[PDB]
Amino acid sequence: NTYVALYKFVPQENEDLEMRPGDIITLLEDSNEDWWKGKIQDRIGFFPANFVQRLQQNEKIFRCVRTFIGCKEQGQITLKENQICVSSEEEQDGFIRVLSGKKKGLIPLDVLENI
C-alpha cells in the first residue's frame, strides 16, 4: 500500500519521517487521521496523513516544471510549478490526464518532469 508525497514535511521530532514532494511512501500503520507511520527508502517514521496521495497500479509520478492554467471547458487542469501529479494513462494530442489530490484533468506533456 504505497503513497506519493505531495508536500514536504520537515521533522520536528526524531520519530518524524522527512518527506520531499515526489517521495514514495510505503504504509506501515494508518495510526490515526492526522499521523501515519511509513517508510521512505530505508527510513521509517511518522508523517502527516493529509500530505500524501494514494498510488494506484501503473501510475507514474510527475513534477510540474512550470505553472499551467488550463481551459476548464476543454477538461484541462491547473497546477503550479513544483506541484506533484500522477497518471496511469497515455498521452493524446500532447496532453495527458493527471490526478493531483482532488484535481483531475488534462495537462500538456511539456509541463511535466518524470521524477
From Swiss-Prot:
S-S bridge residues: none
Subcellular localization(s) per the UniProt record: Cytoplasm, Cytosol; Cell membrane; Cell membrane, Sarcolemma
Record's signal peptide: none
Domain SH3 residue range list: 1-57, 60-115
Role: Promotes expression of the ion channel CACNA1H at the cell membrane, and thereby contributes to the regulation of channel activity. Plays a minor and redundant role in promoting the expression of calcium channel CACNA1S at the cell membrane, and thereby contributes to increased channel activity. Slows down the inactivation rate of the calcium channel CACNA1C.
Subunit structure: Interacts (via SH3 domains) with CACNA1S. Interacts with CACNA1H. Interacts with CACNA1C.
UniProt name for this protein: SH3 and cysteine-rich domain-containing protein
